[PDB]
Design a binder for this molecule. Structure first.
Ligand SMILES: [K+]
Ligand SMILES: [K+]
Ligand SMILES: [Mg+2]
Ligand SMILES: [Mg+2]
Ligand SMILES: [Mg+2]
Ligand SMILES: [Mg+2]
Ligand SMILES: [Mg+2]
Ligand SMILES: [Mg+2]
Ligand SMILES: [Mg+2]
Ligand SMILES: [Mg+2]
Ligand SMILES: [Mg+2]
Lengths: 404, 82, 282, 136, 136
């Protein structure tokens, strides 16, 4: 075969010029994503729920054959997992920030940082709306172009791709190194939602409340002028009126009502929410809306299967890129360990029923090692390797050892 | 100070684009006074729009009063040789 | 499908004053730079005679920064219905207008108050004019390090065989990359070039501006087309009440559906030593 | 009133400064920068050639009967002048959609004062300081 | 212009009320409270006597060529009068950096109305209601 790709990629063109495509977006489009994110309301809350489902449950670092890595780091032994957990103390927060950004924006992006001594400090995120990638003829990122607010306008620079890192969740193809914003992808549905919310709010003000219409004069009678109506407005002024006011009139005064003109804003709101939630891939229930026949049985099981599959796909896509483009470089450059080790970062499932896992262990624990049980149950494995490796319970062995 | 109707501002207005495009699609000729309101001609600056009936789809779609062959609704600019 | 979500830019002027001069971030809108008297020669005297005084005398160059401003006001009906972000566009325009303002203040001081002149009288307008203008400054015992240049002067200079021929320049960079060539910023002992725009100098034709004394250009008898000077001896003094630098503020009207953006900066520009500078004349 | 930049013609923004924007019915078709006067109840029309017909300048092009924004007095405006003008000249509606000087007109008082001078057919900058009506 | 409290002299605040503060280049050195008029493109100079020369009052001391803030139409101001004035007197520039009454001048119309009376050589409080330019 060959040592470089020989199929072309669509991902080359006249830069951030006046053409339109998902990888060709401008700094204005990036700030448009930022404006949707900033401005709050229902749309922001749904996309935050999406970030929390994908990344909010926290994380765990594994190394295949971790114990074999055991080495003196600073006069004391560590394994590579112990070193990584010390290199990234607050990884649960970092994963939520980057995982959030990579759902909103086309990419999460950032820097490695060192101490003055040159020991590793942190992986430091960068504000994704400020940065855009520049790519070669085969679609790989060569440089990062940044512009940012500064005294009296914008300040601009270029950075080499060799010392930033970036992560992409949403892609046009497996070949796409630049990715897609789900905000810009679904911008029509977001605009439609916001327009109908404004339309409902305005319609409630005009039509949701009754209004008094006093008509003055006889039909085909003497005309009443504006100054004449002023003296009538004074008698019926709603600011001066109170609940049990009574009225006395001649025959030629009529106190009519503009009724509240019924319209089903609830059904319109439900329709907007159903459009938006499905556009963002969330279940309808995330929008505080429900439907008949979807609450239980196989209809419930399927929508929750689809949600958990969507989460697993995002989680793996993020996990692989974070290990390959943040953790391995950090191990290679700042660590006594082998960077070619089988590191995994796994992100917790947000929708695990611990009570179901416990009942599973009651049924088939007789076929699981104590370490496999501890893993499913989300606890540390036993301190004794034979206890960890054995199948029958640690308490069931402990009560038998107590028989000696 | 610039209002949305102010002359230097018209090209910024989404509606000025939309209504000029929509005017071109509605017209049968360049004769604006016949086809449009004095308000539209001023507000959307229709003198400056290339209105002539060439962008109206009904210019090209056949719509004969008697059609025994289902020919109506064919658009001549969609044929093999256009 | 949706219409083109785009705007095509206008002409953008060259902005160099912050790099091409010593910038002072002043603490006050008015102030003084203190200046020492020139060096002298120790006088001959007989034995046992009193040594007479001729101590260091001082003066100042006053700065008196003027508030440059630019503003814009738009209705919220327009702002909401716009093709692009109108407030981002007006921010960019306001910022640009104030940078252009600094460059006008700088260039007008630089051209008018330079104390030396080399008159080319047509003739040898390329490298020989730059070398001659360095000579004029050197003859007042200062040494220049920078030059500021008109588009007409640049065009003449890059036609000069001493730059346009690789044999004579010692590199083909001027022929290839014109203004971006490293030799253009490293010529006649000058270690910086500051390419100006034509409109920058104050003709007095612009509204609110009253003109300088010279004509800036290099295409008719008597135009000043370049200035060769010491960058440390020309000061751009910037003052801002609320920071180091240009402030943009978002106005919103208390009553009307009106929003706006207004920029400001205070700038002055003053020679410390006007003898450290020479204009080149057509 | 137009500015030229290369190929392009740009309309000048009429209103430089001030907040005396006020709304009237157009008595006829009017174009941006025209001086206007009261011609009926809240209705404005293009000013005639001497005194007694000025309320403000129209800010945008209108068909007959449409609502008009005026810049009134207490505003600075960009306006086309039909003759050469200089700073301190008082100016007056010209009858031609332009302004002209009081000195040229049959009148003895202006509605705006020239702040920046201009040649015949150029755009002046001026401050509107008065209205004029029927005194008989 | 000055007020006295005990042994101290304080400068008066030239502006009492109003938002009509506008910017010009000074065509000469000017002192706070002087009446000024247009003498070139956006350039102001001290008003001479007998009318045709008033845009507003200078608000702070300036050297020649400096930018000057100026108060005009709709402003309410503290200004030094050349002669005794009373409430409801119309006043206009005196040619001496002060104001004087229309009644005293050769002119027939003022630029400000006295709201609080004053003796000669001291500050009245006045409201600026008009500007005067070259009518010929
Ligand atoms: K006439
Ligand atoms: K007198
Ligand atoms: Mg009757
Ligand atoms: Mg001082
Ligand atoms: Mg002695
Ligand atoms: Mg001496
Ligand atoms: Mg000399
Ligand atoms: Mg090149
Ligand atoms: Mg004002
Ligand atoms: Mg007031
Ligand atoms: Mg007023």
């Amino acid at each position: 075969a060959s040592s470089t790709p020989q199929t072309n990629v669509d991902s080359m063109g006249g830069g951030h010029s006046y053409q339109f495509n998902g990888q060709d977006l401008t700094f204005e489009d990036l700030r448009d994503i930022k404006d949707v994110r900033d401005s709050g309301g229902q749309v922001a809350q749904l996309m935050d729920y999406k970030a929390l489902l994908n990344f909010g449950e926290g994380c765990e670092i594994h190394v295949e054959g971790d114990d074999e890595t055991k080495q003196l780091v600073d006069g004391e032994p560590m394994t590579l997992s112990e070193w990584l957990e010390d290199a990234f103390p607050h990884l649960d927060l970092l994963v939520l920030d980057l995982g959030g950004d990579a759902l909103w924006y086309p990419y999460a992006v950032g820097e490695i940082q060192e101490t003055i001594t040159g020991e590793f400090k942190e992986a430091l995120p960068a504000e994704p709306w400020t940065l855009m990638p520049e790519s070669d003829a085969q679609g790989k990122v060569q440089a990062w172009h940044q512009r940012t607010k500064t005294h009296g306008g914008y300040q601009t620079q270029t950075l080499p791709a060799d010392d930033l890192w970036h992560i992409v969740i949403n892609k046009a193809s497996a070949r796409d190194e630049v990715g897609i914003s789900e905000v810009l992808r679904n911008k029509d549905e977001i605009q439609a939602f916001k327009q109908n919310e404004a339309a409902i709010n305005q319609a409630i003000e005009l039509h949701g409340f009754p209004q008094r219409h006093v008509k003055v004069g006889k039909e085909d009678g003497a005309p009443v002028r504006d100054n004449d109506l002023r003296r009538v407005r004074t008698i019926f002024d709603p600011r001066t009126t109170d609940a049990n006011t009574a009225y006395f009139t001649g025959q030629d005064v009529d106190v009519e009502t503009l009724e509240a003109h019924n319209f089903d804003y609830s059904a319109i709101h439900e329709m907007d929410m159903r459009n938006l939630t499905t556009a963002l891939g969330l279940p309808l229930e995330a929008g505080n809306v429900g439907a008949d026949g979807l609450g239980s049985g196989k209809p419930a099981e399927l929508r929750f299967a689809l949600l958990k599959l969507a989460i697993k796909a995002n989680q793996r896509s993020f996990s692989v890129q974070f290990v390959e483009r943040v953790m391995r470089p950090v191990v290679r450059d700042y660590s006594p360990f082998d960077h070619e080790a089988d590191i995994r970062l796994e992100i917790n499932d947000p929708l695990e029923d611990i009570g179901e896992v416990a009942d599973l262990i009651q049924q088939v624990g007789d076929y699981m090692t104590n370490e496999q049980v501890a893993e499913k149950l989300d606890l540390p494995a036993p301190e004794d390797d034979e206890v960890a490796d054995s199948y029958r319970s640690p308490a069931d062995m402990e009560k038998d050892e107590a028989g000696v | 100070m610039q209002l949305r109707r102010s002359p230097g501002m018209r090209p910024m207005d989404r509606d000025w684009h939309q209504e000029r495009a929509r005017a071109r699609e509605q017209a049968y000729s360049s004769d604006l006074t016949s086809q449009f309101s004095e308000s539209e001609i001023v507000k959307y600056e229709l003198d400056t729009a290339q209105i002539d009936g060439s962008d109206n789809p009904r210019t090209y779609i056949w719509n004969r009063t008697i059609d025994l062959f289902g020919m109506n609704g064919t658009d001549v600019r969609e044929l093999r040789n256009r | 499908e949706q219409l083109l979500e785009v705007v095509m830019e206008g002409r953008e002027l060259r902005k160099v004053a912050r790099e091409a001069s010593n910038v002072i971030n002043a603490n006050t809108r008015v102030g003084d730079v203190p200046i020492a008297s020139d060096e002298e020669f120790a006088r001959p005297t007989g034995q046992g005679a009193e040594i007479r005084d001729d101590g260091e005398t001082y003066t100042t160059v006053a700065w008196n920064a003027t508030k440059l401003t630019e503003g814009s006001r738009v209705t919220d009906e327009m702002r909401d219905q716009a093709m692009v972000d109108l407030i981002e566009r007006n921010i960019q325009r306001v910022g640009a207008s104030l940078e252009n303002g600094i460059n006008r203040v700088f260039l007008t001081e630089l051209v008018d108050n330079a104390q030396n002149n080399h008159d080319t009288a047509g003739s040898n307008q390329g490298y020989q004019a730059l070398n001659s203008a360095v000579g004029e400054v050197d003859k007042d015992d200062f040494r220049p390090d920078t030059y500021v240049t008109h588009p007409d002067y640049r065009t003449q200079l890059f036609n000069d065989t001493n730059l346009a021929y690789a044999n004579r320049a010692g590199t083909n960079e001027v022929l290839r990359n014109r203004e971006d060539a490293p030799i253009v910023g490293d010529i006649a002992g000058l270690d910086m070039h500051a390419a100006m725009s034509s409109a920058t100098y104050d003709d007095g034709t612009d509204i609110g501006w009253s003109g300088g004394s010279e004509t800036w250009g290099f295409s008719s008898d008597g135009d000043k087309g370049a200035v060769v000077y010491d960058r440390d001896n020309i000061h751009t003094i910037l003052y801002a009440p609320n920071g180091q630098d240009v402030e943009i503020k978002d106005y919103e009207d208390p009553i009307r559906d009106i929003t706006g953006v207004n920029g400001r900066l205070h700038v002055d520009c003053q020679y410390s030593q006007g003898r450290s500078s020479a204009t080149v004349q057509y | 009133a137009t500015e030229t930049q290369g190929e392009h013609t740009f309309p000048v923004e009429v209103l430089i400064s001030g907040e005396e924007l006020r709304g009237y019915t157009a008595g006829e078709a009017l174009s941006a920068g025209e001086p206007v006067y009261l011609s009926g109840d809240y209705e404005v029309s293009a000013s005639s050639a001497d005194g007694g017909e000025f309320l403000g300048v129209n800010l945008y092009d209108v068909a007959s009967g449409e609502p008009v924004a005026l810049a009134g007095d207490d505003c600075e405006v960009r306006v086309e002048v039909s003759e050469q003008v200089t700073a301190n000249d008082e100016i007056l509606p010209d009858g031609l959609g332009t302004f002209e000087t009081v000195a040229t007109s049959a009148a003895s008082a202006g509605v705006a004062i020239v702040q920046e001078g201009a040649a015949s057919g150029e755009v002046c900058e001026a401050y509107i300081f008065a209205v004029q009506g029927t005194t008989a």
